[PDB]
Design a protein around this nucleic acid. Sequence first.
DNA 1: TTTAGGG
DNA 2: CCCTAAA
Length: 85
Amino acid sequence: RIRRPFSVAEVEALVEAVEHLGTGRWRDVKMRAFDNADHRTYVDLKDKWKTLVHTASIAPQQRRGEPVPQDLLDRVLAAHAYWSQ
DNA sequence: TTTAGGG
DNA sequence: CCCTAAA
């Protein structure tokens, strides 16, 4: 499949979704926040959560592409610490 | 088919 | 994004 960087709203929709469902229900996350975004499958969302956690763990100057608002990176690490077992 | 992780 | 063992 063709590349397709995640936009800020998509991240936003993902972050909101996970804060409510967690990290073990990507099919529900997909249904809740990307139900009509045919190019994003629950495996892609699982993957974007994996990169987002990393993105939030590195310095801003080493991130690539459109900048994810600090606000979201913040909720990624808080939702990651919460749903971690 | 979905979950869960490495490739 | 892909590949796919397990469930």
